[PDB]
Design a protein around this ligand. Structure first.
Ligand SMILES: *[C@H](C)[C@H]1/C(=C/c2[nH]c(/C=C3N=C(/C=C4\NC(=O)C(CC)=C4C)C(C)=C\3CCC(=O)O)c(CCC(=O)O)c2C)NC(=O)[C@@H]1C
Ligand SMILES: *[C@H](C)[C@H]1/C(=C/c2[nH]c(/C=C3N=C(/C=C4\NC(=O)C(CC)=C4C)C(C)=C\3CCC(=O)O)c(CCC(=O)O)c2C)NC(=O)[C@@H]1C
Ligand SMILES: *[C@H](C)[C@H]1/C(=C/c2[nH]c(/C=C3N=C(/C=C4\NC(=O)C(CC)=C4C)C(C)=C\3CCC(=O)O)c(CCC(=O)O)c2C)NC(=O)[C@@H]1C
Ligand SMILES: *[C@H](C)[C@H]1/C(=C/c2[nH]c(/C=C3N=C(/C=C4\NC(=O)C(CC)=C4C)C(C)=C\3CCC(=O)O)c(CCC(=O)O)c2C)NC(=O)[C@@H]1C
Ligand SMILES: *[C@H](C)[C@H]1/C(=C/c2[nH]c(/C=C3N=C(/C=C4\NC(=O)C(CC)=C4C)C(C)=C\3CCC(=O)O)c(CCC(=O)O)c2C)NC(=O)[C@@H]1C
Lengths: 273, 206
């Protein structure tokens, strides 16, 4: 929830704690068994640094358990601006492209395909670049080479779970976020039998690709602007998947590869199968 | 004998406080529930002393309206406030204040002499503020009226692990629905609980 002040009147960094409540921790003043109120199964309080230790211990000493703690400065921050992704920009590689224009497509392709993740000079792929610019490879084919590269597997696929790798793929190859568990499930199965290469192909192969940014257009963010057959929740998901500019997908951070889109949110938009 | 059921309470004047009603704020609140809770807190914390229109604290009430603080936090804000401190803290003695805060933040009176030791040393070591917190923070406050419930008198009803001779002690503190502890009465603010009856309940070393 929103926090209204970052700091306590006495100087002190407020932290927002979230817990699963327990009947002991708060109970209705009724007769009969003690129940907490249902709407507050996940309760949230903002505590100064000083009371934080004691508050957390009390929570834990009862049946409570702490879902997460987060500084109230980071919390109570703007939802990310969508200025740059509202209108993506879009890059076309013409045939008979200049030296420069090919460069600019390469950069754009790295940026989108790898998340703000930085790619070092040793990481970059001379061979696949070499193919673009003398012809022979499409933009769409280059993209398929990137998502086949180890660099791609090391970041997105070898650290995290397939369930996260899926949405992580949905973002890189299509602006969209995932819509409905069905999609996540299908990719998981395809991966088990066909294996990693087939899965990657199936995004680039799919009709959304080609119908949008078909060939020779570096893929750009479609989400954040209304798409056909796209549940509304998907639009909110996009805000979880995409945090700001100069926010990335990093294996490098502490517990680097987690799931932005809670599995219960997917189930909202469509549950079945 | 032919005493009524109520009789024993009505003779003492504890008829309203005995099984006191509990006011809870709920997840989404009507404009009236909010204003009930607010009235009940102010009446219980300040000891039915009269709070004018200027004395009220608007911000705390707003935060309580947004949902940004629970009732338990609202209680701490009131308790940690110029207005409270002026009535029950700066004019009295620490012995007098402890028994007041005990009554305000938990309807009982003080169970024994040790309760005065842990709360007086606490105050010298750390602030007033840390002391006040230790009350709301304590498990007994959390166990009853832990969150979203206004504190209510627990005195005058058997509570587990009660000491004997709360009942009488709280009767000294309560003294009727029109009584109110008041900084500003003749002969100032003085303890009602006599110190020899404390020792009457155990007194260990420290
Ligand atoms: C009974 C028909 C089925 C069932 C119920 C069941 N519920 C719990 C635990 C809780 N149920 C609730 C429900 C509410 N709390 C509220 O305040 C309200 C109204 C405002 C409701 C309806 C809550 C919050 C709890 C958890 C905490 C509590 O005790 O209040 C259980 C026990 C769960 C446990 O493992 O502790 C059960 C069994 N489940 C069944 O078996 C039936 C199908
Ligand atoms: C079998 C021992 C028990 C069982 C399994 C079960 N799982 C599902 C459905 C899914 N399982 C997953 C989990 C994963 N996500 C990942 O990334 C990985 C690899 C690290 C796994 C294992 C997912 C995503 C699904 C969703 C659908 C799918 O098939 O992918 C089911 C089907 C039920 C459902 O879809 O609602 C089942 C049965 N559950 C049991 O009953 C067994 C005890
Ligand atoms: C240097 C002054 C300090 C420092 C920096 C540092 N940064 C990273 C990693 C990242 N830094 C960023 C930064 C940005 N992303 C953006 O897009 C922008 C603006 C557009 C910025 C400024 C990002 C995205 C990352 C993550 C990806 C990456 O691999 O860099 C590190 C490395 C973190 C790691 O554990 O690998 C470091 C060291 N840290 C210091 O030591 C200096 C105080
Ligand atoms: C007015 C007709 C006359 C008057 C009255 C008067 N009362 C006070 C102060 C208090 N009056 C009460 C009484 C009540 N509390 C209750 O809940 C009830 C009904 C159940 C009553 C009647 C209390 C508790 C106080 C203290 C309030 C506080 O401490 O804030 C005063 C003010 C005296 C003072 O010094 O505070 C006065 C003037 N007195 C007159 O002169 C009028 C003839
Ligand atoms: C039963 C043998 C006899 C009897 C008992 C009786 N007690 C009450 C009311 C109360 N009893 C207590 C007593 C205690 N408080 C304590 O702290 C302890 C242990 C230290 C005890 C034993 C209290 C506080 C009450 C009042 C509050 C409450 O109800 O919990 C009654 C009811 C009288 C009333 O009007 O409340 C009775 C009947 N009386 C008999 O007739 C028996 C001989």
């Amino acid at each position: 929830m929103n926090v209204l002040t970052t700091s306590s009147q006495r100087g002190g960094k407020l932290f927002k704690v979230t817990m699963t409540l327990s009947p002991a921790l708060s109970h209705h003043p009724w007769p009969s068994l003690d129940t907490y109120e249902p709407s507050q199964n996940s309760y949230s309080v903002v505590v100064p640094l000083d009371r934080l230790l004691a508050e957390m211990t009390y929570i834990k000493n009862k049946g409570g358990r702490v879902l997460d703690i987060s500084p109230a400065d980071l919390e109570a921050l703007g939802p990310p601006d969508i200025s740059s992704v509202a209108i993506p920009l879009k890059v076309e590689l013409w045939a008979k492209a200049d030296v420069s224009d090919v460069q600019a497509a390469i950069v754009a392709a790295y940026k989108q395909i790898f998340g703000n993740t930085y790619v070092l000079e040793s990481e970059r792929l001379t061979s696949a670049e070499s193919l673009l610019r003398n012809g022979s490879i499409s933009v769409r084919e280059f993209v398929r080479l990137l998502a086949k590269s180890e660099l791609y597997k090391e970041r997105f696929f070898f650290c995290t779970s397939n369930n996260r790798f899926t949405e992580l793929n949905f973002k890189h190859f299509l602006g969209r976020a995932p819509y409905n568990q069905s999609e996540i499930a299908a990719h998981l199965d395809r991966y088990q039998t066909f294996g990693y290469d087939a899965e990657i192909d199936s995004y680039i192969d799919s009709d959304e690709y080609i119908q949008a940014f078909g060939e020779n257009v570096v893929p750009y963010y479609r989400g954040f602007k209304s798409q056909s057959g796209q549940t509304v929740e998907s639009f909110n998901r996009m805000f979880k998947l995409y945090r700001g500019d100069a926010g990335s997908d990093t294996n490098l951070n502490l517990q680097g590869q987690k799931r932005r889109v809670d599995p219960k949110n997917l189930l909202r938009s469509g549950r079945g199968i | 004998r032919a005493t009524a059921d109520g009789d024993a309470q009505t003779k003492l004047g504890i008829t309203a406080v005995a099984p006191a009603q509990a006011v809870e704020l709920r997840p989404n609140f009507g404009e009236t529930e909010l204003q009930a809770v607010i009235r009940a807190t102010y009446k219980q914390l300040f000891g039915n002393t009269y709070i004018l229109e200027a004395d009220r604290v608007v911000q705390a009430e707003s935060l309580l309206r947004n949902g940004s603080i629970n009732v338990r936090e609202f209680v701490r804000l009131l308790a940690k406030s110029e207005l409270y401190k002026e009535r029950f803290f700066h004019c009295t003695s620490n012995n007098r204040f402890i028994e007041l805060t005990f009554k305000h933040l938990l309807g009982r009176a003080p169970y024994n002499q040790s309760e005065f030791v842990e709360h007086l040393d606490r105050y010298q070591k750390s602030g007033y503020d840390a002391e006040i917190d230790s009350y709301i923070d304590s498990d007994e406050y959390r166990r009853v009226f832990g969150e979203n419930t206004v504190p209510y008198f627990r005195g005058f009803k058997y509570q587990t692990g009660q000491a004997a001779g709360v009942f009488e002690r709280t009767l000294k503190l309560y003294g009727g629905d029109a009584d109110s502890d008041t900084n500003r009465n003749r002969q100032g603010q003085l303890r009602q609980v006599d110190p020899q009856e404390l020792l009457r309940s155990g007194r260990g070393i420290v």
